[PDB]
Ligand binder design. Structure first.
Ligand code: HEM
Ligand code: HEM
Ligand code: HEM
Ligand code: HEM
Ligand code: HEM
Lengths: 306, 305, 304, 306, 306, 306
């Protein structure tokens, strides 16, 4: 069987998101690093087992793929599509490589980020660097429990990993990233009941609102999609809070994994463009996307054999 | 008098916040100071016993005169710039220090958010650092950091104001300096050459014997004896910080002492040197870009405003 | 087919809830059954991954006919009362079982609260027990409890319905009995006499050799071999409970098996005895005050 | 003098046992009191260092007179019933309190078993509650509970008898009340209306500012200043308990203080009200079904008995 | 279908290695014990689950196999082959039975070793007993991280467990044991850079030296072997530090598991006999093997069906 | 004002006991190490803070004291007194220096023992080295809970630390060490009830037997001593299990700390020589002492000022 990267890691309490572009002539340096990134993950992580829980997921963008590799492309790989809604906009920003680094502690993430960027100095330009921290009770920046309905076990594998539909790339996945900044002052002006109507779940107990009370423009209602087969379309989301109190920056870094980008893209269309029953996702009245990129995260064996 | 949590254990995460008080900000600051222990309990209590959240609040010399009438702490003055032959210890603005520590960065951030929320419109941020200790108690240079800090009774005697300034008993003095490292130059040294810079073995943290420890090693220069033959001691809670994209690899220094004269004597030896040492060799790999001195009063002084 | 969490890791806290469905409560019950996996995730997620919260939902024989049309699980029937020469296994009412386990009682209680909140006006509570682990995985008799439970593939084979009843594959059968102990009489036995009752060493939990193990020891009577010479196995997740003021020192027994015939053969040996054993000596110190049988369907059955 | 473990580290489980001493049970009770520290060590030592087992033993006013022939603690009297215009604080029988705490209920239960085993035939049980920590130190109303308890030196000064009653130095006074909550009525309030009852924010546990905090909020009525302008403080170790089938959702209140006058002044404000407040709004959702006062002597007083 | 023993154990911090010979006439006692060893593992281990992580792996030597069992032998079972190199020697020492006992705590290991040796008294003679302990961040006595490049998951199963090539013994494995004593005085006279050239990795950070700088006689270069298909040949090594400061004994207990002994034997030949480019493994200039034995560790159900 | 060594350490799960003799001419090397032992303890221990709990207590024997130091001697310092009972003997064996090393993990103990013995090579000869481990719920090799009745807090300080009776040595303590080997075959031939009569406590529950059933020759009855003024004479005992399954060696390493050796020596006299009511301690019918040494453990500041 093809070995996937650690896409299906549990939630961790810390993360570093690194997005870079590949400079002209940086291709060979990048390929050498990609062939070593699993050995660097083991080097930093092994000595901190079993509590460290260090992993790195490496993704490659559409344009970068054509510069790095000859032969077949993954079927679903394309640049992130800008969404220009009546009120809210999902921007497309540059990114050739994603490093999604997770651990129980920020220092382990930083040590791996240092070894990776050390090997890439002179070959890449940093576009985004976010140090994420989950709150102690699994809450996000908005004060809600975050990750509850993520798939687990066999359902997660089926939702997230490329299989027989694209056999040369089996065990890969597609990652969409968006960095969101929140209007915390406007959010904290809402009553708890009004915040629950925005999300679609109870704030303290994390119980879903019943179908009779859940607004059609609630985050949970708009991101609930059924496929051709009547089954739920599922993604794995590993949202991380980040920020700077001095700059009044209060963010959620969104990363969503899926077997095809079509699922994530359908959810984004419903959020930003709306439906017959909803102008847009009410979460967007308190959240502005300032980045947007799509990456293919190949099977671990594809990176090793390069 | 109850001291603030100056004598906290080691924590793996910290936020350092330094702000200046804007024109007319005094009343807003006084209200927050009277509430900061209650905000620390509000954020921290629900995460006990693993959170280990604490906040130490410090006030600078100029800010003291704007906020309070009556007696000043005897040792409170602005940070003294040291302009050495090679290396310089700079002075930068700061009226208020918040030294926030916990087992996890999210608890530090949640307390920092409530504090800055109450101070919006009254202060200007000067510095914000999110610190993380390495899982083996190492700093950015790869050395174990904090080994010779005093503990128990020796720590109380070294750090807390007593009968020499009785109105301020239970207070302390904090010196902060943000350092940026030349990691490329440091990593070009052999481990043996790095051990000669610090004065300790890198892997095992055993002190070099007096016959091998260079006179210009960090441990040799920061070892000071008082007139009475006693070691002069401070409590240092150094925290790594950085940004890989910006190639920023730092150590945030904070040193607590019963009088600033001890910390200032250590800085003079590091920056100006001795008869036997031009300067602290750690400064050939470390540049100070901030410098501020604060008085951290007893907790009941802040509560009684 | 996805089973419920019948094969849960060891947990230190449990709530057992047994209710009857009132006349006209059927639709309220069906709506809750379709939601119970969502409620388990809602309560459990905020304590992940150390919470280990799970709920196993079971349905009784009589309740099954009131709730559903079409096929019944092949083994589902009311608990059979056993009237032995000395000891009796009583049958008591129960339409729904909630077997709630976690590493802490708060998670169990919060899930029990949401479930009973949805069922208010539709059900009558029959039994509620709050169980706790007692130091060294010990029970109220001071013996290690759970040692010989099957694990891995052997556990799946022993506990889950397969191809013998294909519409119900991934289901299981749960037998529950609440036991109260005579701790005064038990503590009057020497340790060596207690070891002869159970069939294992008290401190070290080593099985007694075949030459010394009495025929009427608990371990000898509950050891049954099937047609092929293989041991017939169940998964037992016994939990201590009690009230010191009322002198109630209990074991809540729950036994999971792929067919109730295995568990029922063990109960017959214990209560009725054999040619070699009058009855299980554990029953001279333990009185059953409840007895019910439930089918715990595959998770996908409850969702649709 | 060595105090009992009144100032215990944080624990997640408790058993509260209240018994009366039967006629002729005095000798059996005295023998047990002289042994209760040895029983605590016997059950607890084998589970060190994580068990954190302690037992605090309290004696009521009437029981004190039956057991001991010398001086009484200055503040010991039967619990004073408070008959308010709306709410009543009942006085119920209790001679002995066992306040048993640990990191796990098994240790509490095993110690309760050994104590009651020694007292069979000499006492009648009045009350038995098994308490548990609920999430992030919340009580059954969904609020964080314990936040403003004193710590360290301030706790010692607030809770332990000193030079004002020198024969009893190291002792304390415990008031117990078992409360049952009307959860249906409580859950009909908005979160903002709940916060006005308590005096703190529900999710974040931030105290309401003095300009918004109602005069009849729990935090406003239990905030008392003494003759010198200093705050009068108690140590409260509230524990949730209940039974979902019987719809019993409770708070077991125990308050420790150096003199019962502090706790009694707080109860008078709650139940009888002030010029500005009819009564504590928490009592519109909470009914006291027990009320007892106990003196918890220094450990060496119990050890030195016949 | 065949259940392997716990060859692929999670990470554990304590171990006992017991090697015994079977005395003349001890065969029947040994067969009875082998049929009971999984029941003894459950008896000691269950009460400490789930954090105890107690397991025992039982191995049988080539000569003992012929004394105990009639019928088929595992295809790869033979006595350990002595290697007489120009400088360094890998000695063969007697051993009929291996007990590889691991747990999170030494007490569980010791209690299981006690029950096993209790059943075997008068049937076996102990040859070697070592109590191993985890040393800081997974370091060995040379101060290097040890275990980094072990296979995990499916790759570990494929490398370690017998499959269809020897179908009667599927789910078995081969264990090679060597007890090594280190010359710590000579090792600590090397600079860290000279130590890194011996191992082939950075000491503090555990990053592999690049192919241009890694010496051909480094430990990592000599133990890196490719098979006929260009794939790396892998083993599972679970090295444990041990020692006695008073006797200046600073040791590594090596145990290597593989699906066939030919892989481990090829690594030993390269270390002891060298290649065209390396006289021998430089680690052997600081490490002396004082035992050497090979065992077959059968599937669990082979032992149970005695 | 004098700082004691960590005689009153929290509970630890691992220990190394090192006893050495000082070779002719080794005095100066020993004095240098004594002045550095607190610095070595911090160097090894800091990197594992705060859960490591590493401490070293250094003791000096009577003969060694006279070789190392001039002037006043601790008032109670003498060689261990051999006890020649009618049946049982307490042997005196050589030992000049004791290192009593404790931590939550063996690796910290071992690393500190290595640094100490490294500094002492050529100046000392090892006499005894034992690696101790916690055995289940604080049990010893006889299956009984061990340490239950040790004093704690202020009572422990008063029992263990030299004060005004020997003011030049205030803050010191006296340690008696005896290595015991158990006859486990003889012990396992007793019923549990017969074992309980040997110890004087219940085996599973660790409840003391009542005064009406506790035999006069039980361990608990013989080690219970009152002084002329009615107060209990107390020691701090920190017994550690050790052993080797292959050698059938099952031991208890006894170390007892007291403010004067007269207390410990009175307990040993009652055990070995007996009383009017008891021939000897019945624990000695299953336990043989194979070492016996007495050391003075000075105040930390005494060692630092060399
Ligand atoms: C500001 C950014 C976001 C925040 C703070 C956020 C937060 C949340 C929260 C609190 C929940 C409820 C608990 C849970 O199931 O995890 C949720 C559910 C979910 N979110 Fe988001 N979200 C964000 C952006 C997105 C985006 C961009 C997507 C899709 C492209 C997305 C997809 C989902 C999905 C699919 C669910 C699960 C719905 C269900 O089946 O119940 N989220 N989110
Ligand atoms: C610039 C970055 C700095 C770094 C990375 C650093 C790092 C270290 C390290 C690794 C040690 C040895 C372990 C220990 O005892 O903690 C140490 C010791 C010490 N440092 Fe620093 N340090 C820095 C700045 C300073 C400053 C600014 C002062 C005083 C003003 C200072 C005072 C000391 C003292 C007093 C010791 C203990 C010396 C002794 O053994 O007595 N350090 N430092
Ligand atoms: C008062 C109620 C009960 C108590 C206190 C109790 C206690 C125990 C104990 C201490 C063991 C030995 C350790 C272990 O393997 O778990 C055991 C084993 C066992 N019990 Fe029970 N038990 C009770 C009721 C039952 C019931 C009602 C059944 C079956 C219907 C049952 C079936 C078994 C089985 C099958 C074993 C494993 C036998 C073997 O293969 O070794 N038990 N029980
Ligand atoms: C149903 C019964 C009760 C409940 C649910 C309850 C709950 C709470 C809560 C949520 C708080 C705020 C957080 C904190 O500081 O602990 C609080 C504070 C407090 N409660 Fe209660 N309480 C109850 C009864 C009592 C009683 C009977 C007394 C005293 C006789 C009392 C005295 C206090 C005090 C002194 C405070 C702290 C006020 C301050 O200084 O901020 N409580 N309680
Ligand atoms: C003195 C005894 C030994 C010591 C101290 C030792 C230490 C190490 C160290 C530090 C590494 C690097 C980290 C790692 O991947 O584990 C390593 C790797 C390895 N060792 Fe050893 N080892 C010893 C004996 C052996 C023996 C006898 C064999 C084989 C028969 C062996 C096979 C290996 C293998 C296959 C690797 C992984 C190489 C790679 O692909 O990266 N070692 N060992």
């Amino acid at each position: 069987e093809p070995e996937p990267q650690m896409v299906l890691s549990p939630l961790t309490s810390a993360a570093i998101f690194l997005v870079v572009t590949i400079d002209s002539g940086g291709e060979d340096t990048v390929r050498d690093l990609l062939s070593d990134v699993a050995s660097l993950e083991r080097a930093v992580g092994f000595r901190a087992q079993p509590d460290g829980r260090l992993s790195c997921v490496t993704g490659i963008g559409s344009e970068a793929w054509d510069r790095l590799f000859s032969g077949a492309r993954p079927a679903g790989l394309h640049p992130f599509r800008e969404l220009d809604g009546p009120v809210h906009r999902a921007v497309a920003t540059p990114g050739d490589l994603l490093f999604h680094i997770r651990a129980s502690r920020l220092d382990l993430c930083f040590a791996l980020a240092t070894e990776i960027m050390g090997r890439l100095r002179g070959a890449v330009t940093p576009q985004d660097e976010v140090h994420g921290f989950k709150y102690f009770d699994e809450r996000d920046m908005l004060g809600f429990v975050d990750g509850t309905e993520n798939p687990t076990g066999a359902a997660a594998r089926r939702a997230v990993l490329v299989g027989a539909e694209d056999p040369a790339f089996a065990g890969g996945s597609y990652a969409v990233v968006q960095k969101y900044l929140h209007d915390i002052d406007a959010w904290e002006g809402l009553s708890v009941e009004a915040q629950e109507r925005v999300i679609g779940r109870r704030k303290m107990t994390d119980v879903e609102l019943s179908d009779d009370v859940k607004p059609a423009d609630s985050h949970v209602a708009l991101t609930s999609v059924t496929g051709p087969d009547g089954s739920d379309l599922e993604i794995l989301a590993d949202n991380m809070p980040f920020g700077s109190v001095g700059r009044e920056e209060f963010g959620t870094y969104f990363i969503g994994y899926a077997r095809t980008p079509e699922v994530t893209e359908t959810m984004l269309e419903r959020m930003f463009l709306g439906t017959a029953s909803a102008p847009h996702d009410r979460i967007l009245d308190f959240s502005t996307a300032v980045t947007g990129s799509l990456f293919f995260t190949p099977a671990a064996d594809f990176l090793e054999d390069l």
